[PDB]
Amino acid sequence: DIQMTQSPSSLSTSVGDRVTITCRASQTISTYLNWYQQKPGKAPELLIYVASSLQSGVPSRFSGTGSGTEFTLTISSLQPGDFATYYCQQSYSSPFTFGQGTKVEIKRTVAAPSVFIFPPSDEQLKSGTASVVCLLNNFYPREAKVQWKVDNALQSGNSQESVTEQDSKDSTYSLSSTLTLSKADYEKHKVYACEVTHQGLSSPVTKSFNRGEC
């Protein structure tokens, strides 16, 4: 029926900068266009209804314009807490449909990660599995490279990583990389090393431990 397309699909801007989000409707929807903001782990929140009316309690740096097929959401001065995906939604014809979303990312100064490594606990080992966790804490930008070496042998296929969404206050990321082995395979090697490469580091950083040492 009525399809909504937003642009851009993603953008990265500094704090205090103007952000402009465009929404186009496949047919004319008068002013029946709403804007929502969704932060990590949260439901979407209404920002602007009927194209230009500010929802009660929304800060005045948000504003919306448009009618017919072309609509614009503007943030006059981006704030760190404004990290979110922004959605438009036409309310002209059932079924109500949403745009695909614009992801707004905050551009801040480079910050190197702090690296920590954790050996598996004895409780997990006795159950027959070894999880080795490498933590990269509070860095920017999001791009990072984590490599596992076990007795200097590079590992592949036996790790999974997870990245937090951008922090609403300092605009950094954190990343965990978990190396998983059976207890039998774990007990065959001594040195377990996590090697981190990041723009904030002049040279790669390695954190390691020896199995069975403290």
Partner: protein, 222 residues
Amino acid sequence: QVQLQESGPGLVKPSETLSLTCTVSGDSISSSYYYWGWIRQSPVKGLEWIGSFFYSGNTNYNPSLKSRVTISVDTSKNQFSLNLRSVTAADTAVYYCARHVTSISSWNRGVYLDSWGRGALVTVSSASTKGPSVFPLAPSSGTAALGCLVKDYFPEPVTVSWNSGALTSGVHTFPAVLQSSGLYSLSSVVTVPSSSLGTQTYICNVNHKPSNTKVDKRVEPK
């Protein structure tokens, strides 16, 4: 102004009926200018309007689901409900209840979604629920990092807090990762001053409601 809260099972077997209930606090279900409906969200389909229940009693469903959807209200308990029949993996999503507000009197067009529930994740799968095992991430001998490994649970989600919620600064609870076993696993870490190791006790509280698992795990330097 109004607070919505979804409740219902987080795991539904394929071909069975998904049922959720929204409880509304702060105003009545009955009105002459707002009404009630449901939205869902998944990574690949994005946001998807499901349907609504107008205050005149009239229902309106998304044509892509209409045969399978029923929405009803209970003005006595101040609740309204969603039933989605014959579900499949394509129905795994986060389900929101939402208040529909008319901008023009008696008019179905120009409606906006005032308040949303927190979201209820529903996973459609034939697999069985499994509670997580919780292992410490012991701090190593100015700033130290410790944490908890929350491993091998199904389905999503788990919630993690530290020291019964008294510790929030510096906590990072990572998004869960699906392992090749079909089970989920995540870590929750926190950075603390190295001076506090030995004087301060650090407990991580893990709650997995699909399996009725509540685990407190004390995290020691070794």
